[PDB]
From a paper:
Sugars and other sweet-tasting compounds are detected by the sweet taste receptor, a member of the class C GPCR family. To address this gap, here we present cryo-electron microscopy (cryo-EM) structures of the sweet receptor in the inactive, unliganded state, as well as in the activated, sucralose- and advantame-bound states.
We also determined the structures of the human/human receptor in the presence of advantame; in addition to the compact and loose conformations, we observed an intermediate state with partial separation between the LB2s. Although its interactions with [name] differ from those of sucralose, advantame elicits a comparable conformational change: the bottom of LB2 lifts by up to 8 Å, and the clamshell opening decreases from 112° (apo) to 104° (compact) and 103° (loose). The closure of the [name] VFT clamshell induced by sweetener binding leads to the formation of salt bridges between LB1 Lys65 and LB2 Asp278, which are brought into proximity in the compact state and engage further to form stable interactions in the loose state. First, agonist binding induces clamshell closure in [name], accompanied by a stabilizing salt bridge that defines the compact state.
Numbering used by the authors:
A (entry chain B): 23 to 246, 253 to 353, 368 to 556
B (entry chain A): 25 to 44, 58 to 340, 358 to 555
Write the structure that this text describes.
Amino acid sequence: LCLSQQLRMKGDYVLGGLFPLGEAEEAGLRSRTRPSSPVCTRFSSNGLLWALAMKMAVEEINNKSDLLPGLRLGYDLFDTCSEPVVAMKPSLMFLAKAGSRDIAAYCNYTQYQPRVLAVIGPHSSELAMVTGKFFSFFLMPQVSYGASMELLSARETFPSFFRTVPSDRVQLTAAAELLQEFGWNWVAALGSDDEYGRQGLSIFSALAAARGICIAHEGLVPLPLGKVQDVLHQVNQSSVQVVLLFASVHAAHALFNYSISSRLSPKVWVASEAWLTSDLVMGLPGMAQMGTVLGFLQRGAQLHEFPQYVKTHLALATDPAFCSAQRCPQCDCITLQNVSAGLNHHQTFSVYAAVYSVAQALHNTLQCNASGCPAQDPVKPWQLLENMYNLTFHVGGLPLRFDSSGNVDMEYDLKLWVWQGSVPRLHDVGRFNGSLRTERLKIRWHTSDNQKPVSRCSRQCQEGQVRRVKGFHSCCYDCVDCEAGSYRQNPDDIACTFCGQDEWSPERSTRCFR
Amino acid sequence: SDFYLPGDYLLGGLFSLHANMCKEYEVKVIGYNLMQAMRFAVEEINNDSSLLPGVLLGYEIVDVCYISNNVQPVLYFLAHEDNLLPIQEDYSNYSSRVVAVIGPDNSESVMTVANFLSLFLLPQITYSAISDELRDKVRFPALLRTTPSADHHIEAMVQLMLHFRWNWIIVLVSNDTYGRDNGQLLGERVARRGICIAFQETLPTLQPNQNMTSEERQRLVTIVDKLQQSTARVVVVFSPDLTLYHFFNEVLRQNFTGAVWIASESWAIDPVLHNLTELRHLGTFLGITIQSVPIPGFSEFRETCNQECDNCLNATLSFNTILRLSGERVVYSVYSAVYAVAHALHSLLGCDKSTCTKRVVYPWQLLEEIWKVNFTLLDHQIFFDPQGDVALHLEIVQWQWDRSQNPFQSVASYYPLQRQLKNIQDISWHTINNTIPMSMCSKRCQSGQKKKPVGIHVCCFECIDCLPGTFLNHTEDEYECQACPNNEWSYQSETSCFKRQ
Ligand SMILES: COC(=O)[C@H](Cc1ccccc1)NC(=O)[C@H](CC(=O)O)NCCCc1ccc(OC)c(O)c1
């Protein structure tokens, strides 16, 4: 076929694009002795899907007369093989002046002239950070699908970063609202042993303290053995019924595999989105015994016409007449057998929206009239940025907005797992848009009597009961009714003291008597 | 000016002269100290004809105060000697303006610069950057460190705690990477050894030049109240220095006393925190830092953008007193880094005592040679472990307030190759009669008295007598009593049974 050659498209303005067209060979991960650019060959469907989706979005912008009237908008896509080393080279290429192969050093770059107008950013948050630190110095506007880490919202370090997916803090505030509204206070929080889960733990630990939720244990579970046994043992020794599992897929898979292997107890699990789309996790045969699973999932329109477009253009890509119309081997050896699994992935909309945003931002920057654009000097990136920072735009007829933190405002659904025998299915229970609404009466529980489980702590005692502090931050108390025959001693002391040989006192007594 | 010196080969240097145009932030004494330290090192290497004959070794230095400006000096170092920088699939034949970079000291900027220099395999040596993830040579192939890792600092803390038998500690962490990562690492280390964390709390980020809000004050008040009511009197602190000035003042306002404070390497040697008079009331202050090695002749040497400093001399002229009393602890890292590059370069050129057969030094070859050096400086062997670390001695210090004495007294020495704490000397405690301070969740039980756990922490247990008809076999179990044989009895709390009908 001839499909790599389509990854570049001339125009009056050009969008840079970063996608994982390939994947690194997990078995090799060759270490480097000499400073050559690494190469990858292993194909992956979803990265190419997003690439085609971008091509589709730019094609739509070119077809329509309303946006960028009479201009030709192009694109320039490159393969980020998940490595910072691989991703950095095209990041530099984006900045080399037109026709050149060189990037001159300067003390300042508001004066400079890069060859692309904006960069559609990489999927993963690690590459998002690495490339954002570089791009933001040049004030190159970067619009990212996929990357959700909240650290990228900080404008003191990422002044030019935007994204069409909500950051983790929205999901975790929804989770905190869920915990508070249901009246649970005593919970355990596990993150995966990667920066996604660890930073999620930081965010959730900060959020919970504002609402009285006291974390019984704040643990991390490894990615690929005694560690999981220790973590689950400490969670089991805690009298916790509600567990937050903000994990990557493989870590959750391992945790549940061992929990089934250990005949673990059933519990309420609150799910990360990455786990919640659980096709390979929910297939574990023992999963039904683990207790009820809830989680917050994005809601957004699918790019309904996408599969037909992919069919059409992969049919065209093998037509030798179309070949009469560069940077990836094995991209030209792809047919629908390889690709036709991910066609429904919602990331395609986020990619689609991303392109639209830049187009609209340029359209507002040029101030093009509906009949045609005014005469203009070639627009610069830092000229887009100031108009883009407060944008409102329409994608598929849906309105969208960037606030100054760079995130889109988008709502979430509460999803519950329902067991059709051995088949688990996702079902809808509620909605979150800054406040939480739930169909409480529609939930089914794992307890034999189908009633809500209880997980909470007494945050104050009464009558001078014996107190013990508990919780990872020491914000819960457990209260003990000191038994008749011993007395409180000091009302803040750890334990009671016994009366004399001929003395006695009642229950909870702060005194001793005869 | 000091920031540039020509030569036949050049070293790049990144130093944080200001806190967080970097001049807008407050000048830091230690940053300027290390800035001049590198100058002394290069002066020595240019003087000694035996180390690099027929070669002048130059340097260029740029300020990196914080995560702000890090991209600029990297692009400025990598240029092809005329501000150009070609985009290549292979850089094997490329002459960068510097052959090596003496990189930053704060983890975020270190990683930021390393991710960029990794493309060219330009060797980077960083001083005093601790984060353990820097041991990953697949993620960071080009990076080496003249400092022990966070692993060793935490292990030294743990062995200090074990030696004086402290089971019950409070951990305070700043609201950023330095606090969070080291708090997690300490959490991993502590649990396996029988020590227990009473609770962990995140300190709110505050600045001495800024007014504290009432919300932040309430947060600090809550933390200090938790400190006040708890039985754990050992406090470990992971924070940059600036946050602490408010914190301790609040601690002083609430009349807290009697704790042992363990300072991590970020603030264990801060002169400014040391200067406050009232900290004497808060108990003993201990810290962990790399050992003093005296650089000979050094002190009387210290007496196109972001390459300047106006405040440095005026701000340093006062704290130079404390520096002169102190042990030059971090200077040796920079000194050794420059000497390591010098030896690797000498052997890369195949140079004799007489002359060097000069060649275009492509940085990847200099990295290949830097991996192999092994030599003595000031009677200490330096060579790189495969992960890129250099085995400097760690040292535990007590803060001493008899002014005009040495302000940071050595009390123990930690050897990393042996992973062991040794040569412990006297620590003068705050206690009423200079006894070792005590902290456990509960007191050790009497004989014949079994242990009953109070919570998740193994460190916490009640004591309960074994009843008549049972005895406690300490040698085999201690959490439950044992029944006496078929014709024996016991007198409640006792270790053994006796014969009775
Ligand atoms: C994010 O940085 C941190 O949180 C802190 C504080 C800091 C912030 C900004 C710039 C520099 C340091 N880092 C450290 O203490 C690093 C460990 C690491 O960061 O890997 N060990 C350095 C100990 C001697 C030191 C020399 C120079 C100093 O200033 C010029 C300074 O403050 C401390």
